[PDB]
């Protein structure tokens, strides 16, 4: 039933604004003073419970914390018309940023703020009766996202133990870049996330920009569009907990079905009926077309090509008016294709889910209205190419200790760079070995 | 996150006066000090540069120092001069005489305690202190000597903060004073040890900007000080307004300096264009980036084509797409690939801010870290060695008390800075 | 032309937000005329669901 | 200190740095003896 959301740093808070806007509009949470003055669904239902708790007087409050080291973005949430929602204790802001230094966030500044965050999360976790996971949004390219994200997941992993943790993460794009020190922060972050996360969702900004240019008709996209797409994906995955359906899927089923070995937990994500209003009125959108669409690389939200690898597992979530027989016909057609390949040790490669609630339309939004949608998370060996490129860029910079003096000044030993680089090299070797056929001479 | 300003010497006091006019205009503060703005976004970060006095009033967080009160009386007589706190005006009783050693050792040690007491008193009142901001010329006498003395004292007292300096440096042809090489060399020697980041401006570059780009028939020092105030106010813009990708002085320093000695940068501001001509310019991101890399808009005499960029930063003000910024910076890196140092995979940092400077629909300020600055240091070392070998004017400084070994040490340290720039310029992967 | 200047959040997510609904206001504005609203709720004390019948 | 303004940061009971002194969320507790087992087998008359 319950899930707690933790938003860290700039990308995580900006994606959080879009997420809570969407979940409010889907449930019907509105200003108390603003009477609807119009026809509404009017059905008292428990669906809010996954994200809201009641005070008994009927006010709703959301299960989220906003964490940042610079004040500007959180002070911006405290000044809008959305101040009335969050409990003021939930909006936590520090005094100064981690200045793109992972060492500064982890050792110097996040160490002061971390105990307040754990006390607030405990106060939230005490007001639950069937918590089944945390959703975390952060980018590993920046200093506070890497350092405080690692420190907070380590403390959560010791205190809460077996509970599942699903992360939505914005990784550094392979050639578009915003800061010079991105490789160092991403390697050091990835070292901590490897040990302390149950499922990791992979995102690349260059893919979501390409998807918004090719499918939608936007010449000049901005971060609000990407965050609205991320919010739609999170709403699709959490819909299985909140509404009636033919084949439900609990969040523990994702972890049991998608992860074969405890280190192989990095997954790709994609969404099908991303379509504009002008195209939407020229075409029908049946199940087989969107099932064929989710496997084309033009539909993916991460810049990797799956034709250069092998699928290990796919989890397909369908929402809206779909009938299981059409899903079975679609999956049999996908299975026939020769350019889609599964490792021979994974014969039953698919898990299906079918939910009746169609995706919501937001008044200022750019997506069209559609009766059905499908979202996919899949595990594939192609991901090894992203790490190889980050490690090559790290090796180029690290051969001359290009910026190490900042990290050494903020408290970290030079040895830690080599340890993290060797651990990510071992993850690359794991993906090389796991994908090798166990063929036997006879 | 508040900045404390220090204004030293004639150049520093005049540029500071124009800077505080520009900042007061941007936040809608009347010349009486009363807030009269029309949006909370103006008020919500006013603390960054102003302290609040009782019943509405604001006072600017600045210390004014000079050795003869003529300039101080001129700035106090100016249109916004009344805003300054009277106790913050510090002056002596005899001039610097254009001599670094007298300004640093004899009248410096006499006045320095009262300025340090005021600067410490102002800094310790803040709930969290960000770096100091100092404006001065390096070629003068009280600017160089007392500015570097104060810089050294603040570095002793606040070693964990950031230290930023803005400095004006001598043209190779337009000298205003005969003894410029000694004062410049000693000041650069002091700054390279004490400073964290130093910005440099050539009066020759501002003259060429005004004549070629703005086509001014009769420019005045108010225009040059307005260009400087524009860049200075642009660098701090992300500290005090919302945006899609926030940035900070410490974040700029960590991304711009690869090694601690390489902290001297060039500056530029893009939507500069002369009055009268029906061409508008600046109406899209390609226009700003193309003008941004045009050497007509760069504030140093050295030209980038003789060097290579180690790193660069662009801070954009205005409502714009991140794709146009990102794809323009990628296209510029790919098309001019020979001018970017190859062992760094991406040399440009971008930042976007929602609030533009008043009267412009959009603007960008550019900061560049380029090795061509080594030609300027070589030029200063040549003129210094020509004068020192012949003892051209040393008796004034020696009469104040300096040992010649300080001059030989400062020359050697500057020569080593030139060598370090040259080795990193010609480094290769192999 | 440049009298109105929004920021991106207010332009996209909360466009209809008037200047009277933000935390910072002048000290000479009336407060009794503004309707009370200090939390978010599904219903506006609506009678269809809150009343318990007997 | 970390919170700011307080004389001193209050001690925390929920969490701790030391892994052998922190308080786990999922307390692994005991079932009552009544609700287990089979109970008496009772026959009707056919």
């Amino acid at each position: 039933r319950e899930a707690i959301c933790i938003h860290i740093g700039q990308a995580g808070c900006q994606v959080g604004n879009a997420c809570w806007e969407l979940f409010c509009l889907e449930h019907g949470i509105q200003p108390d003073g603003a009477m609807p003055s119009d026809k509404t669904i009017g059905v008292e239902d428990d669906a809010f419970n996954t994200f809201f708790s009641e005070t008994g007087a009927g006010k709703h409050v959301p299960r989220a914390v906003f964490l940042d080291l610079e004040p500007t973005v959180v002070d911006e949430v405290r000044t809008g018309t959305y101040r009335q929602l969050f409990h003021p204790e939930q909006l936590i802001s520090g005094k100064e940023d981690a200045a793109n230094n992972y060492a500064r966030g982890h050792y110097t500044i996040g160490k002061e703020i971390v105990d307040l965050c754990l006390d607030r999360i405990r106060k939230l976790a005490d007001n639950c009766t069937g918590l089944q996971g945390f959703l975390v949004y952060h980018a590993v390219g920046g200093g506070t996202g890497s350092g405080l994200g690692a420190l907070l997941l380590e403390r959560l992993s010791v205190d809460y133990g077996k509970k599942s943790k699903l992360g939505y993460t914005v990784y550094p794009s392979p050639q578009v870049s915003t800061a010079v020190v991105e490789p160092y922060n991403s390697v050091l972050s990835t070292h901590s996330l490897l040990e302390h996360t149950d499922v990791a969702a992979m995102l690349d900004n260059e893919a979501i920009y390409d998807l918004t240019r090719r499918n939608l008709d936007i010449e000049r996209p901005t971060y609000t569009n990407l965050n609205r797409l991320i919010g739609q994906v999170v709403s699709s995955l959490t819909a299985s907990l909140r509404f009636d359906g033919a084949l439900n899927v609990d969040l523990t089923e994702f972890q049991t079905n998608l992860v074969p070995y405890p280190r192989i937990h990095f997954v790709l994500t994609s969404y099908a009926p991303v379509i504009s209003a002008e195209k939407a009125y020229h075409e029908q959108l049946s199940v087989s077309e969107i099932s064929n669409a989710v496997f084309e690389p033009a539909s993916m939200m991460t810049k990797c090509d799956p034709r250069h690898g092998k699928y290990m597992a796919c989890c397909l979530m369908y929402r809206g008016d779909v009938v299981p027989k059409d899903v079975n016909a679609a999956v049999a057609t996908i299975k026939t294709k020769r350019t889609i390949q599964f490792v021979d040790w994974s014969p039953t490669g698919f898990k299906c889910g079918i939910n009746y609630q169609p995706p919501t339309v937001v008044p200022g939004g750019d997506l069209a209205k559609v009766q059905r949608a499908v979202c996919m998370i899949a595990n594939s060996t192609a991901i090894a190419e992203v790490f190889a490129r980050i490690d090559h860029k790290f090796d180029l910079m690290y051969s001359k200790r290009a910026f190490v003096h900042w990290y050494v000044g903020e408290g970290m030993e030079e040895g830690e760079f080599s340890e993290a680089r060797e651990d990510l090299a071992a993850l690359e070797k794991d993906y090389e070995e796991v994908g090798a056929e166990s063929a036997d001479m006879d | 996150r508040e900045i404390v300003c220090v204004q030293a010497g004639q150049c520093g006091n005049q540029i500071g006066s124009k800077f505080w006019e520009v900042i007061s205009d941007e936040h809608g503060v009347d010349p009486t000090g009363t807030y009269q703005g029309d949006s909370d976004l103006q008020l919500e970060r006013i603390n960054v540069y102003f302290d609040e006095a009782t019943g509405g009033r604001y006072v600017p967080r600045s210390v004014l120092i000079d050795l003869e009160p003529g300039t101080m009386d001129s700035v106090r007589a100016g249109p916004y001069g009344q805003i300054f706190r009277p106790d913050n005006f510090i002056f002596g009783q005899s001039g610097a005489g254009n001599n670094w050693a007298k300004g640093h050792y004899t009248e410096g040690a006499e006045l320095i305690d009262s300025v340090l007491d005021v600067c410490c008193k102002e800094a310790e009142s803040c709930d969290c202190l960000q770096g100091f901001q100092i404006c001065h010329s390096l070629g003068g006498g009280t600017g160089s000597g007392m500015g570097t003395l104060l810089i050294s004292k603040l570095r002793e007292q606040y070693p964990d903060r950031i230290m930023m300096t803005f400095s004006i440096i001598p043209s190779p042809k337009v000298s205003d004073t005969v003894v410029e090489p000694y004062n410049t060399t000693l000041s650069v020697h002091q700054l390279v040890e004490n400073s964290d980041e130093s910005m440099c401006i050539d009066n020759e570059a501002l003259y060429d900007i005004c004549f070629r780009t703005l086509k001014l028939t009769t420019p005045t020092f108010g225009d040059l000080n307005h260009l400087v105030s524009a860049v200075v106010s642009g660098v701090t813009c992300c500290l005090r307004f919302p945006g899609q990708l926030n940035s900070d002085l410490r974040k700029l320093a960590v991304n711009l300096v690869p090694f601690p000695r390489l902290h001297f940068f060039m500056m530029g501001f893009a939507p500069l264009t002369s009055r009268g001509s029906q061409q508008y310019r600046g109406l899209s991101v390609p226009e700003l980036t193309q003008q941004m890399f045009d050497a007509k808009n760069m504030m140093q005499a050295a030209d980038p084509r003789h060097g290579r960029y180690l790193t660069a930063s662009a801070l954009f003000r205005g409502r714009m797409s991140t794709k146009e910024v990102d794809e323009q910076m990628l296209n510029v890196q790919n098309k001019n690939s020979s001018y970017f140092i190859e062992w760094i995979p991406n040399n440009i940092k971008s930042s976007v801010c929602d609030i533009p400077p008043k009267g412009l629909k959009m603007a960008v300020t550019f900061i560049g870290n380029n090795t061509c600055i080594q030609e300027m240091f070589r030029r200063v070392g040549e003129q210094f060695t020509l004068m020192f070998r012949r003892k051209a004017f040393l008796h004034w400084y020696t009469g104040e008390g300096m040992d010649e070994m300080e001059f030989t040490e400062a020359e050697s340290n500057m020569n080593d800075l030139v060598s370090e720039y040259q080795q990193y310029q010609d480094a290769t992967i192999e | 032309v440049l009298n109105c200047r929004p920021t991106t959040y207010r332009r996209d997510y909360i466009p209809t937000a008037q200047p009277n609904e933000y935390r910072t206001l002048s000290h000479k504005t009336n407060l009794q005329d503004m309707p009370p609203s200090f939390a978010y709720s599904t219903y506006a004390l609506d009678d269809p669901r809150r009343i318990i019948k007997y | 200190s970390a919170f700011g303004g307080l004389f001193s940061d209050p001690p925390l009971v929920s969490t701790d740095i030391d892994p052998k002194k922190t308080d786990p969320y999922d307390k692994m507790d005991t079932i009552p003896s009544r609700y287990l087992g089979k109970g008496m087998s009772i026959g009707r008359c056919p």
């Binding site: 101040r83 003021p88 802001s93 520090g94 | 807030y35 709930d127 007292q157 | 910072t24 206001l25 | -």
Partner: peptide, 28 residues
Amino acid sequence: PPKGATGVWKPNTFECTSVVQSCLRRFY
């Protein structure tokens, strides 16, 4: 100086803003 840590006197601090803040209306 009385053999202490230099004849410098450190001025006090004025305000200390906290981490969590209220969301009630604030006036100019």
